[PDB]
Amino acid sequence: SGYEVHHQKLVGSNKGAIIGLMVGGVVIA
Amino acid sequence: SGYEVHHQKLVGSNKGAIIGLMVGGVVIA
Amino acid sequence: SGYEVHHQKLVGSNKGAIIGLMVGGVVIA
Amino acid sequence: SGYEVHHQKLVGSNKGAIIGLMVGGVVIA
Amino acid sequence: SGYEVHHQKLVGSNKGAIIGLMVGGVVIA
Amino acid sequence: SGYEVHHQKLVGSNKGAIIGLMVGGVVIA
Amino acid sequence: SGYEVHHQKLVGSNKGAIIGLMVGGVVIA
Amino acid sequence: SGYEVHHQKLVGSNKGAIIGLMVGGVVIA
Amino acid sequence: SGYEVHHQKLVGSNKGAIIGLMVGGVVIA
Amino acid sequence: SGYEVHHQKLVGSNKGAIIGLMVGGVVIA
């Protein structure tokens, strides 16, 4: 038991939000 | 128990928000 | 128990916010 | 228990905010 | 218990803000 | 007869293409 | 006959392409 | 007959391309 | 017959490319 | 017949490229 995020690959253009793990807070994309 | 984020690869152009781990706060992309 | 972020690689152009770990505060990308 | 950020590599052009760990404050990218 | 940021490498051109650890204040990139 | 574009006002954040008049060429937004 | 662009006002943050008149060429936003 | 661009006002932060008139070439924003 | 760009006003901050008239070449913002 | 750029005013902080007229070459901002 726990939370984890691993081994991913992203390529190209970002203009929004990219987030690995979110435990709280607010994201206006 | 815990939170972690590892071994990821990102390539190219960013104009937004990229975040590994978010525990609180606000992100206007 | 804890929070951690490791071994990631980023390549190219940034004009936004890149953040390893966020525990609070505000990010206007 | 604690917060940490390690072993990451960044390459290329920055015009925004790059932050290892954020515990508070404000970031206008 | 504590906060730390280590073993990262950054290469290329900066015109914004690069910050290891932020505990308060304001960053206009 | 002719082409013209006038008296417009834009306010806020741009991350795409804003073009007054386009007679040819290519725009990847 | 002709092409023209006038009297416009833009305010705030730009991270993309802003172009008055485009007669040819390529724009990667 | 001709091409012209006049009387515009721009205010704030630029991190992209701002161009009055473009007759050819390439713009990577 | 011709190309011209006049009477414009820019205020604030720049980290990209600002160009009055472009007849050729390449811009990497 | 010709190309010209006149009567503009620029105020504030520059860290990129400001160009009146470009007839060729390359601009890495």
Numbering used by the authors:
A (entry chain J), B (entry chain H), C (entry chain F), D (entry chain D), E (entry chain B), F (entry chain I), ...: 14 to 42
Question: How is this structure described in the published paper?
Answer:
The Uppsala APP mutation (Δ690–695 in APP, Δ19–24 in Aβ) is the first known multi-codon deletion causing autosomal dominant AD. Discovered in three individuals from a family in Sweden, this mutation gives rise to a dominantly inherited form of early onset fAD. Post mortem analysis of Uppsala APP brain tissue is consistent with typical AD pathology, showing abundant deposition of extracellular Aβ plaques, primarily composed of AβUpp(1–42)Δ19–24 or an N-terminally truncated form, alongside intracellular tau tangles. To summarize, we solved the fibril structures underlying the tau and Aβ pathologies in a transgenic mouse model and a patient carrying the Uppsala APP mutation, the first known multi-codon deletion mutation in the APP gene leading to AD.
